[model samples]
Target chain A: SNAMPLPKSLKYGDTIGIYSPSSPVTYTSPKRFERAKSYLLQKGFHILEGSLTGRYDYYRSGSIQERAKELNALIRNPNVSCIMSTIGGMNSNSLLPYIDYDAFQNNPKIMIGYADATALLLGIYAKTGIPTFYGPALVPSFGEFEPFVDDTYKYFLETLLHDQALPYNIKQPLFWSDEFINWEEKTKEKELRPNNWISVTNGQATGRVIGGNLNTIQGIWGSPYMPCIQEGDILFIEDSSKDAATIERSFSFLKINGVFDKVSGIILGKHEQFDDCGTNRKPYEILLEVLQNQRIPLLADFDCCATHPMITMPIGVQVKMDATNKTIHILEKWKI
Target chain B: PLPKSLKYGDTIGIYSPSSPVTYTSPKRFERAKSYLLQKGFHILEGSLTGRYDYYRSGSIQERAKELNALIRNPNVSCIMSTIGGMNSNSLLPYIDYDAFQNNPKIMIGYADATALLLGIYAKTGIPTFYGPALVPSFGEFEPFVDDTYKYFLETLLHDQALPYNIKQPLFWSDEFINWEEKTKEKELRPNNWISVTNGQATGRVIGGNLNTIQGIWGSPYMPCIQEGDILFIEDSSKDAATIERSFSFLKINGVFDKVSGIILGKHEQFDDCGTNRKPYEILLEVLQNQRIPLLADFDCCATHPMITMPIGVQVKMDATNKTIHILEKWKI
Candidate 1:
């Protein structure tokens, strides 16, 4: 199975390894995992539950070592077409020391996840030049008992598998009606103020689409796991539970590591939890201070890819970051 | 009129105790010595006086020699440093512990000059003064506070036992005279105290730069400080987030757990936050000294005409009461 070329689709018997590398998946019970596996079975896709797949710690899914083993094993297993995390959780740093990043360099091709494992996602790209998706987790957003989201279903089934080039002009989405409907429940998507793509500045920058949950990169600062912001790369960030100060800490670590010095442009994903009680300092104000010295073009979208119905980007595909026209021009397609 | 902290014939010498290179002039040194002379005291120079250091007073050897000489020199009763710098740890290994431990006299202090104070006090159980230096607040600012000098010479030096309140000046500019014509605006402020988690606290004053102190935490130069010490921790302009992070490190280290209160000295040119709003908004932000007696004022003369604190002296504070009283009268 080619790792870089966008797959046509996960056809029948496509074996995707399920590994939990970050936090635990208490969201699902053994029955739900069975139901999810059955659902995948019905779709003809084979599910390979990686070691520690159903781990249920209080918050974390499993220990970093457990997740690393399952992940590294799946990456080397040529029979496995791709690898995915069960969910995202706090403290992804625990997983860093245990993984073999060198394996990522040698065996680069494979699908992964975009949940709380963002530290791993951004780090692998920075260190190994390997690109991984910053999209949803399989056990929750992807494997919920609720009806499959049409947009997300199409994205994972068709766009992610077959599309060689991807450009997103997604408008901010509205509420997700489901079992979790109350605003107090937190995970439910509340209808939001209309958000549009706006250019803070107009200029042209090009690079592969990169970055994940903003806070995850902090765990890797001054360490081997920190993201390597390369020239001509579009940097994107998103979050769930963090507030402004949390974002500030993440940004400060990036500055300390000189992230602004390496990247060409910026993109901020819509973070629902962080939006209502926005920081005393607007998010852009904090970002602009770091970006000002760089003078690169910047683009921000309210339709953050970290949440549900996420548009799974072609991770390594070269794209144009243009605030001038307000679009990410797919300049080059990813290849195997 | 004299304080017991210093005698009429006492000699106060200056050194690069913890800091380096802010003062670079013999003329400036002369001016400071001249001021002390007028105060009726003999002035002594540390071995390498007027030498510009890359950091600290001089090399660690230079700082240690000057420090030990003063400690052992019966002629020198009080010691002062030029400024505070990062190399305090370097000086510790070289300083003579017995010389400081055996010294029985009171000493004048210096600023950003915390390294020596913490080191000597921690290693020898002697309280080092944390006050103004010869250059910044002492020798001259645009407008020098006569009280910055008077409070020391008249109160501490003369040992004047009296309740003294340092009213923070409303305006400061030194376009004119000998302490008289200097534009010193006197403004009314509530007494210098605020509650931490909303309760009264009383203790001695202890603390210095957040950055410098953290570096010396585990070293022999640090004290095994107990509770009831009002930690007057001051800092320069740092982002609110960074300030919170610094405070967080202290809390985790249990520095706050041992202190009765917190007095945040005048902050200069802050980032991420201003005089308007502070950054430690949430509870348990552990980074934001939210749980302690969090008092902030544009006063305390930090980074200004510094009023040197007779550190280790008992300072009673009631955050809930919003009052502070330095327990000792000046020694005369």
Candidate 2:
């Protein structure tokens, strides 16, 4: 249970290295890719592009070895300060054994990403004991338009760039949306929904926050790469475009594995396009049934999730979840 | 491990482990029940019969109770599954393995029922059958049903000598037909086990319903994939993309390195996801350099004209001869 060294906080002109570990979103959506890179480039940061920048191989970006090499190149390079994913896909877990964990441990850049990237983030953390950010990916976060993308970048800056004191409180965004619009041909703005976080239980819990996309976690579950859920840890889980039955099964999986019994609190994020399957219930409601009276403090619809206007959160740092006040704050500084 | 063989006139107690197939397909349900009854055996229905709760038979607790009632019944010499469905893994924690240990019976099922089957086998060390379920097997029409029953009877009833051989069927079928709306016979094609590697390996045979196995994987219920274990895997109605991910998952987990041989059951209605690649071919791509004696298109899957293989029993896979030999007797 030794804490790993964290990389320095982000600064202007710092090199942000991006790699494609899974989906070939760059090749599929070139316009968005360019927009994402341009958005970051204009922000006074030097972007070090990975080897597999515009490559595509059907579903994935490249072969397992090729993807590993792409990531390793950035990891070994001294110029690269932050390593981020272009987007997450299904096969990121395939690169767990092939990852150069030794090089990563020695260099120890700020590893950051989400979705399928959870496999890599968790794997690297488990192997090297270094913490990673369960924050935004390259394309999805920076590629978007208007206040949404700016809201996301605001949180990113507050957490990573602007050096603040311990116990940094995350400001809740007033509006959010998971509304669908054609990425390549975006002709109109998405409908904004008034945002509110549901406090299922009233109490405060302070612990290390862990977990990512519930569906993607299944690929790495039970493997050595997955970090053990420590006692009193806050389990953070969210999903995207999944129905009630699937969500129920995943929740049940956590229940059967006694995850509910161990974690002191839960931070359930907003689900992106959840289908209730005629149950007419939200994701938290489904989880409540699975909880079966194990009344742990729960804060639902936390913005640091698959939904838009996402907040940036540290994966392995102590966090205080004040359910009564509907607030979350970092209890410890994540960076060295 | 040791087995419990079923005799004729033995009462076959059937329970719905997951899906509410008995209620959803009443005609097939009764026909399958009658098929078993006409074979000089009595039938005992579990409490979940003719019950439905959305996609599953009942809640997790209710389903577990139903299966436990069947397991505790002294009259049930053989406990068969009504059908396999997705929700069986949820009931793994609540099964009556104690009653199953006290009165050991021949537990048989396939597909999603693998969760229950493997869980029981791992928990109690009692052998369960990775074979055909009642509604899907006995409810099936014509030569297929007859052939399926023949295999089941030969595996369970006959007091065969040691080192019993499982014969390869002349033909098999995965032809799709609506269960409740079927008014015609399905087309059968020639059956042959494609031996990808040529060698003979003898070891304990284990594994079932590869997809369902993933749900309970890494939990205590899943038996460890030990070295020299002949791993048997099969899937139903999954596309090439999904199967590729699954096979890659196992390969990444080092399952191929641990297992001595592989037995791939025939995939039912396998969608190729525009890749037009077979499941075994995808497995080969995933396996890459990891080579072992490989047997493909083997029966005892979700397909019709099945075979009953006792899990947790030692068996020999001869890829060169395309044959499987039981190294130890199943009878306890």
Candidate 3:
């Protein structure tokens, strides 16, 4: 896969163009939408709304052409330093063939989001050599409550703004939550617990991390849009609000394709409101059974997921996955 | 891809590849087994009989082993699933394709077993039957079960002539009754296949359970959606939104652009999601500009008294006349 040109580090007062590539969360959740825009604006970033902003077309923002145009407009614009998704839904992959990849290559910017945005993020990285962020989306991340939102922004800032020395260590948050609460109108703050990533198998290895939302991955899988998972590549996968059967099927999808034999290690992001279907099993247990005792180094419940206080990590970057110590470290400079 | 129409007294093996239906529904299981036994076919039981491990019949390896045992057995003339459930795709990797090559029996099932049916066909080039399972098909009460058994007999037992016209069952039902306690007969409705776009488009028919197709869609096991192939898809108990998403998936994969015709089966308990739009209409919206000869509410799906269709076998779908014909001789 060609690596697109790296985007320069962002500064205060830089513009972060927002697009609704999938769900119309801006039109559906106005309170959270306003709150998210205000949150990023307060952080010294100008928010330029894409054409599809505040527009709802049933399940999505608009037609596929309209969504593609929204993203292409931001890619062509010189002032927008970064483009983020409002929220992820089922149809982002529908925009891949129609995206302005040439304009994106001409003007490389920080293209970041999670969930359904994985389609665009990984597609861009695969088609162009430019790495994309698997960190936060606009409505789901920035619109979150205090402390959690601040923690997410901290990682976003560290990855995009601050140029760290070689081997930047990603820190584990003191606390986190996947608690279910109404987004637009919150009755009370969500309860948080002490956070700790699980080492499914204790070992250490370094490789480029790839992958995002497991369900969303299927939409672009086997197509030119999906990047090939090379040998020793670290697969980072996460999902949201899925049952045990769905988890099993997706994990099997990877295994049957011989992905387990290729990847050196895996970083399973914390599942948001996962249903165990009375098995009382986590997503990792399902993966373990699917692995058939391969014992590849696997770190489960990593913070970079669909959950609160999500950490932003760049795709296609070399990273050290220390499953034993529950740590990840970026081995190279991320920004230009 | 040829069919393995069976002879009388040949053993038909039943295996639980997904759900533990035999243990969960003993009455239905016994009735189904007895029905086949009365038809001069002996019943062979797989290892997973009366087994349950929560959601599935067993672990992936255990399920694969159960299926492989039937594949290896020479006495079994045909292997049928007790019922279809989620996680059938999990068995794809561990399935002994080598053993299956040694003994290529008639593999018959529908629903989630689409993964197995399609996988085996793709791997070994052996045609599998996309038809009724044991408990769900034969266990039903009189009239419906009789119609289903008749269709099964017509397809499997009778040495029908070439270019056999597939009979459309005059009546059908999507009626629901508790499997455990089925004390009454279901309300039967008149069935008619609707020609959405009235035109004749003859091609090789392929596809089964739409939702199950998604699990193995991009895998090596999935058969390619060849050009001019007739696509038949059916789903059970899914909403309009989910169907739309799935249809969009096929459209994005360029399946819509390639298929010569479309055969949509009757959705069992389809929720319209307040739009009050039929599944075919949702599909039309997904199709956008591309229009082909389309037939709706066709049988041989996840509904009662389903017809038996051979996967990977060449067949003709005439949407204009709302009829399907088995063009090539399936008997081998």
Reference-based TM-score of each model: 0.48, 0.93, 0.93
For the predicted complex of model 3, DockQ is 0.48
Task: Locate the minimum summed-lDDT window of 10 residues in model 3 chain B.
Answer: B240-249
| Candidate 3 residue lDDT tens string, A218-310 | 777777788999999999999889988888988988988888989999999999899887789989999999999798998999998878898
Which predicted model would earn the best DockQ? 3
Tens-digit lDDT track of model 2 for B190-236 = 88899888788989898998877777777778888899999999998
TM-score (C-alpha) between model 3 and the true structure: 0.93
Greater-TM-score candidate between 1 and 2: 2
Using lDDT as the measure, name the better of candidate 1 and candidate 3.
3
Residues B106-194, candidate 1, lDDT per residue (tens digit)?
55544345656777767655566666666555666333447577656544554434444433444433222232222454332333333
Fraction of the reference Cα-Cα interface contacts (below 8 Å) that each candidate reproduces: 0.00, 0.20, 0.33
Candidate 3 per-residue C-alpha lDDT over B212-267 given as tens digits, one digit per residue, 9 for 90 to 100: 88888777789888998889899889986567667867876788778898889999
Off by over 4 Å in 1: A1-12, A26-42, A100-108, A144-148, A163-195, A275-282, A289-295, B1-332
- How many Å off is the CA of A165 in candidate 1? 5.6
Interface DockQ per candidate: 0.03, 0.43, 0.48
Candidate 3 residue B239 Cα shift, in angstroms, is 2.9
Arrange candidates by lDDT, highest first: which order? 3, 2, 1
Q: What are the interface RMSDs of all the models?
A: 14.1, 2.0, 2.1
Worst 10 residues of 2 chain A by lDDT: A1-10
